[PDB]
């Protein structure tokens, strides 16, 4: 989790407050990241081509 949080800041300049992880049945790790309330998600997803 420490590496994931630091990496996100250096790539997308976004800050988080909580990160959860799990290991899928196929063998890859999926990470949920929640953003600070002062920033909205949708626009960042569109700006960074998410959805």
């Amino acid at each position: 989790k420490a590496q994931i949080k630091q990496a996100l800041k250096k790539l997308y300049d976004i800050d988080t407050v909580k990160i959860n992880t799990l290991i899928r049945p196929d063998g890859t790790k999926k990470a949920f990241a929640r953003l600070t309330p002062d920033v909205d998600a949708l626009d960042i997803a569109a700006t960074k081509l998410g959805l």
């Binding site: 290991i23 196929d26 063998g27």
Partner: protein, 50 residues
């Protein structure tokens, strides 16, 4: 069981990946002989040793 170890988890992941039919072009390549998968597994037929 719901209690597993990382090694047992890892083995199950690989054993799940290698069980699906052959893609389609492979039977349309020049000088090919494969017909149907010869190493199909099924959870209610044959257990391999973990």
């Amino acid at each position: 069981p719901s209690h597993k170890t990382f090694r047992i988890k890892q083995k199950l992941a690989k054993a799940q990946k290698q069980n699906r039919p052959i893609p389609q072009w492979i039977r349309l390549r020049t000088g090919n002989t494969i017909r149907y998968n010869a190493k199909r597994r099924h959870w209610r037929k044959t257990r391999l040793g973990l």
